[PDB]
Amino acid sequence: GHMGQIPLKEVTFARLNDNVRETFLKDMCRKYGEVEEVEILLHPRTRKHLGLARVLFTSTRGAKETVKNLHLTSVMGNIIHAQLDIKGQQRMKYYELIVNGSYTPQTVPT
């Protein structure tokens, strides 16, 4: 890939339906790229799904294609947000807004 200052291989998801956990994310992302790692973010005290996830791909092409196919796509009844993210910078902003701010998993501003 040529667009980033570093390779763009990691996707941040937000507003995931709380049934979309590690196995689902792997099952659905592997249709769009080679998946290396999946992580869902949980509330620090309740351990509940924040609707946030990280998916790391083998190539930048897999990450771009996942974003193209899944951004603004409805998956078990919720519209997903999916974008390339460097070092979880946007992911951790969403984490703070839900966990320590007034927002919820389905209302976090992206």
Cα 44 versus chain centre, distance: 18
Sheet strand arrangement including 81-84: 35-42, 49-57, 10-14, 81-84
- Packing angle between helix 22-29 and helix 60-70, nearest 10 degrees? 100
Backbone phi, psi, residue 68, to 5°: -55, -40
Experimental method: X-ray
Structural resolution in Å: 1.7
User: 33-56 burial, b for 16+ CB within 10 Å, e for fewer?
Assistant: bebeebebbeeeeeeebbbbbbbb
d(CA 39, CA 37): 7
